[PDB]
Amino acid sequence: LTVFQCITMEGWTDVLYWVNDAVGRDWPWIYFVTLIIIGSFFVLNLVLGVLSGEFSKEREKAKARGDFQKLREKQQLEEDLKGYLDWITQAEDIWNRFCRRKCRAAVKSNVFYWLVIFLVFLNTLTIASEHYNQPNWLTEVQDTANKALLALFTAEMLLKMYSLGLQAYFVSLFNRFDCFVVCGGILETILVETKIMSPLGISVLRCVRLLRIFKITRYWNSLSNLVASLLNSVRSIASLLLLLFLFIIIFSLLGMQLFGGKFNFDEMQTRRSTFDNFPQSLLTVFQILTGEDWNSVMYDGIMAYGGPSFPGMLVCIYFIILFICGNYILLNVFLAIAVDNLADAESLTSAQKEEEEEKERKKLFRLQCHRIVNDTIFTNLILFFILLSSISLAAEDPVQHTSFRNHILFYFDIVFTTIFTLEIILKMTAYGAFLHKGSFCRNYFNILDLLVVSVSLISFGIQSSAINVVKILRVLRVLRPLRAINRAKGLKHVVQCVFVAIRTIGNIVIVTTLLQFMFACIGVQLFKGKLYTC
Amino acid sequence: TFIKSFQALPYVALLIVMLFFIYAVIGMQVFGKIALNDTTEINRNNNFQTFPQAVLLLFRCATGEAWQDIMLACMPGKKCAPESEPCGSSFAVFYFISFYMLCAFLIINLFVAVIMDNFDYLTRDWSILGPHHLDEFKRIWAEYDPEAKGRIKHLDVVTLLRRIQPCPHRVACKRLVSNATLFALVRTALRIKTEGNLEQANEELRAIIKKLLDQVVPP
Amino acid sequence: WPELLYRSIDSHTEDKGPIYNYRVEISIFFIIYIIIIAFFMMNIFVGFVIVTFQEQGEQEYKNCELDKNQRQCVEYALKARPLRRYIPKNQHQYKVWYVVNSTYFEYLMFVLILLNTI
Amino acid sequence: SIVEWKPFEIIILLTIFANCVALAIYIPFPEDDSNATNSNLERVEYLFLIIFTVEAFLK
Amino acid sequence: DVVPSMRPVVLVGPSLKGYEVTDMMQKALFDFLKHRFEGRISITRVTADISLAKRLAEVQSEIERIFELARTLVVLDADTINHPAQLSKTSLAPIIVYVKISSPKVLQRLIKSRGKSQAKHLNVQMVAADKLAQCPPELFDVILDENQLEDACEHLADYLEAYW
Ligand SMILES: CCCCCCCCCCCCCCCC
Ligand SMILES: CCCCCCCCCCCCCCCC
Ligand SMILES: CCCCCCCCCCCCCCCC
Ligand SMILES: [Ca+2]
Ligand SMILES: [Ca+2]
């Protein structure tokens, strides 16, 4: 039971510290660290591998099921409706209605698009400006800004409504969503004026304003393809989520019949995560699924069913099965949804975008007797010096101010500063020195060698000052190990591939950050200081 | 196979070690002198005093183990340890949040790199023949033949361990007639093409695909 | 998480202390946030990294050539190498070799180790 | 048998849903306590028993 | 045979000209033709038949008056040509344009918006689109694939630079 408690990583460190307090701190960390690494990380890696790889099988079968091919059919379909309805839009106008051409012209113009983006920025700044005890004037500023932005947004919304065909306008998903958010804003105005608004109303309506903040991220396609695939798969998404919801209901209704109201102990009732009533049994089951304080709930159940004994304490079966099935059933549903759909979504960025690109294409100092020698053995030698320099500061004593070892490490620092400035002197001989077409400024990694050396040197320059300036210099001097990157031939490949991965992740990470900001704004609206407790 | 993949991607592991090292050192100097005390996260068992302890604390934070309380422990205003002749910075929030994101990202990166490296086997229907079939064929032949003692020497059908997965319609006899045995099985177990010219067609393939002795391949 | 959830459920009014289970509907906010952000979006991170690495690995897709199974097989075309068996020559050696190498001996030794762990 | 041709399985699944609802309301009081609702859910359970056993007999 | 000093321009639309939608596919289109070919292009409006040409009474002078405008050194618009066959009966060295809807599923959506009177008359309209999906490239010279006007309009001008 305890080893299994460590594999799930929850309550891990508690048993490690309890053991350390019994058999000393020296060796015991080995056991639990190896337990975590081996058990948790290898099993997690293997389950991810055998799901993702398996998910590729069902993806391959799906491609025969026309799942992706049919998706492209609904994309070009709706796409061409606007383009052809544009003709009628441009043909219905060949009472005088010559201003229609001008109003439509601004709609596609960059001036109006960037103006509306800026208005959205003001909208998000106003709501994001929330604050616990707002200055009294800021409340009026926020309210009047909300009124103003509402008036404008509805004005240009109607402008697009009449400038473009109403049917064509409603065809687009984004325009329908914008109509939804503006209607929510109208509701905001009416409810606030009539004073019949309710906390659910303020919550969901601040939410609709924040939705209107989705007007940002419109040009980009990577999120758009994900959204399109998600909308296509909704009828498939709802099945998995319905199944998981049914499973949580079952494992909550079972906990009610097992631990229903048996969590009454003479100890102080901090058992908030209890099984008493169904609305809270769900929260406890959800907590177990994510596995935050799984230990606490399992221990409470064990104690409820007697103490540690054979007839009791068998309850561990329920918690173990719940946790295993959960973090397996959750893993299947969520990886399936985030791989099959995303893999399909990513293929739109490669299927329709790629061919369309083709369609457009189809439509169309001293320099003499220098010594660069010895730069071969010095490769490994500099590697070794970097390694030992890194090890140097690690062994430093942080807690002893008048340290018996800091002066020794100061000697090592002096020696290694000399050694690592030798190659700084050398680099002048090689092409560079910010001259000779700037061969030195074409490899910033080479420059980064000086920066760390400079800070190391700069530490001594102000060291004699005995002043607080040098305090940060020591902290920053830790950049030494990275020097190996520029001196390593594979580590460079690894770090560059990692940066490429980051650049790829950019879209998803920014979408997650924006949606998290949405939820932060809603949370500010709900709990703006209602958490204090004496 | 998973262990072998880990061998082939050591620099990602070295990168993770570099992250741990840099962050352990940074935590060593800023949050070094925090006063140890029970009833708080920074205690005798977690602290940035000795490098092993700093690495252990950062590992604890990596496993998502109440790292938020550690963060709140290192936020400023904390009494400094007696060794000082107060301590605690406001840099903690950025330190721990950045560490969590970066360590999670590199752990994900290592996991998916190994998944990429083992993708071939992790995505294998086990229906088409695989190297396991070749290994069991090698073992049965070794039982039939000790070290490097097979050139033709064949007059029996004891090599019937081949099950339904590659004498049905005597195709086995025809395949036997048509390292040489392994090559013939490979080219014909898949049944790539049947036009009476695969040997010629393959004879024009091994030349471009290859290097080593090809005076036995044609047979 | 649960500490925050059960401190927020007890949120009565601005600048006032908590009340036991005042509004337990608030859990909808935390439930939705949990599922969407954590589960959905971090799993999207993992799936997106998987897809990107799969795409990068298939850079040398070489669709003109045939399956990769033949690739592995022909790269193994240097197989059929000697394998160490060393059938004992001495008959006294041969008896112990046969009894040791029989599957019965292996099964028995597995039972021994299993009982040892028990 | 021909009754199964008549789609009563819809009403049977609505009955299963009704029973699923009739279990969230059942509050499990600590030690034998029971309010009024818990004293009518036994009767509702008897009804569900009868309908399910009739369906089992038919099928 | 002999060019009428010009290559007359016609457009059959994606389906019958008898309804509003087909004309509107070209009503604005013709506007840009003269607005970017000042003096280089001329347009004509007729309502009679031109298929019956021997290279009805109104047809006799119809071919001449077109040739009268062709001798000025031209775009024709009618309701007779629903297929290049309707114009293949005469050899006037013409240029003919075709509006294409690659997905007939779009036809209903376009029809479903203008009016419910002809909404049930889609079968009348769509069959021509089918009829406009058979002629090989030879009778399918001018191509209108892209959707909006600006991208499509640029592909009209390029074919007009064959001679001028
Ligand atoms: C899933 C692991 C546990 C399942 C079996 C229950 C274990 C019960 C045996 C341990 C208790 C023995 C008596 C202890 C007396 C203090
Ligand atoms: C299915 C995932 C878990 C969902 C947990 C939240 C369920 C709803 C709880 C609140 C129900 C109403 C409470 C009583 C009336 C205010
Ligand atoms: C599917 C809709 C109906 C779901 C509810 C069916 C059972 C309701 C009966 C029990 C309700 C409590 C009444 C107890 C007397 C105060
Ligand atoms: Ca925890
Ligand atoms: Ca966790």
Author numbering:
A (entry chain A): 354 to 447, 509 to 778, 889 to 943, 964 to 1078
B (entry chain A): 1400 to 1484, 1494 to 1574, 1582 to 1593, 1607 to 1638, 1647 to 1655
C (entry chain A): 1137 to 1254
D (entry chain A): 119 to 177
E (entry chain C): 222 to 276, 297 to 314, 317 to 407
Sentences from the paper on this structure:
The voltage-gated calcium channel CaV1.2 is essential for cardiac and vessel smooth muscle contractility and brain function. The structure of the CaV1.2 channel complex is composed of a pore-forming α1 subunit and auxiliary subunits α2δ1 and β2b. Its α1 subunit consists of four repeat transmembrane domains (DI−DIV). Each domain contains six transmembrane helices (S1−S6) and forms the channel in a domain-swapped fashion.
In this study, we determine the near-atomic resolution cryo-EM structure of apo CaV1.2 and analyzed the distribution pattern as well as potential impacts on the gating of a collection of pathogenic mutations in CaV1.2. The pore diameter profile indicates that the current structure represents an inactivated state with a closed intracellular gate. Although all S4 helices in the four VSDs are in an ‘up’ conformation, the intracellular gate remains closed, suggesting that the structure of CaV1.2 was captured in an inactivated state. In addition, the α2δ1 subunit was clearly resolved and sits on the extracellular side of CaV1.2, interacting with the E149, D150, and D151 residues from the DI repeat. The β2b subunit is composed of a GK domain and an SH3 domain and is associated with the cytosolic AID region of CaV1.2. With the local conformational shifts on the S6 helices in CaV1.2, the intracellular gate is formed by L401, S405, L749, V753, V1182, I1186, F1519, and I1523. Our current CaV1.2 structure provides a template to map these disease-related mutations into the 3D structure. In our CaV1.2 structure, both G402 and G406 are located on the S6DI helix and close to the intracellular gate. In the current CaV1.2 structure, L762 on the S6DII helix is located around the cytosolic membrane surface. In the current CaV1.2 structure, R511 and R518 are located at a cytosolic amphiphilic helix N-terminal to S1DII (denoted as S0DII).
